[PDB]
């Protein structure tokens, strides 16, 4: 019926209107591309997340083990943000940050601001006042089961470090969404991350899928990324893409993977083909010829964002 469709779309814009635009969806949806975004590195990530990269003034949350990718994916992210003009800040309590690293991927690690706070409050706190200031384009908070409340670190009952996370998430929400700010939360599958699950605007699960060879040597793993939670554009898409020993998320990997999922480049054999012009014989020459042609990097880029969302 007709009179069923005019009562489900006043009901979906009441529920819009009450609780905020993302609210409820439908998983087939198109996304509302906002002005600007925080690119991740991948181009299948960018589209997994449905706006072509991470929300601004949200809180973000990455989790997953122990050597899946995620502080990869944050740094990526950072790199974006400062390549696009931000100011970055990585508050630190795991004390694990790889600088050479961080810059052979693209971060400008010389500009990064880096706390490395004495308790857990003490973390957020920063976050806060850094968030606050109104200078920040993203801060990363390196991680959540390494924010030790400070009665714990003093040996003085357990449960509060939940109710830490809470508090200061209902802080620092307001401040984010003011400043324009984007924070991203690592998380570590082993937390104070029932509350995060909540206030988080996107939640990424992030594991390494395969590793990848040359010859006999790994030079890399396949990543997955899923979209578990995504208020922005509809949820649980998923992303591949390749994190490279020593390099960081494969650009031009993602590129050619996004490229012949969207019909833009074409399979005649193990080769590769963009618009009758050849990329390169199997998955590796045709990832090289991306690195050492920036331009037809950019081309393919260009119009794969076109041909749907952004
Ligand atoms: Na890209
Ligand atoms: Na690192």
Redesign the pocket.
Known sequence: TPDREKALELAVAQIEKSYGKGSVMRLGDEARQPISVIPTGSIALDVALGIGGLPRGRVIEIYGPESSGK??VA?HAVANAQAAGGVAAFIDAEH???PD??KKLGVDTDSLLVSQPDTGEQALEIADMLIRSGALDIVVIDSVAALVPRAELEGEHVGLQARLMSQALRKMTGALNNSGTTAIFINQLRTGGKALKFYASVRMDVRRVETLKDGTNAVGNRTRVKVVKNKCSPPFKQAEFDILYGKGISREGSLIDMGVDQGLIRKSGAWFTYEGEQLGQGKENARNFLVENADVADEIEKKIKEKLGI
């Open positions: 502080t990869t740094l694990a940050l790889d690293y961080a």
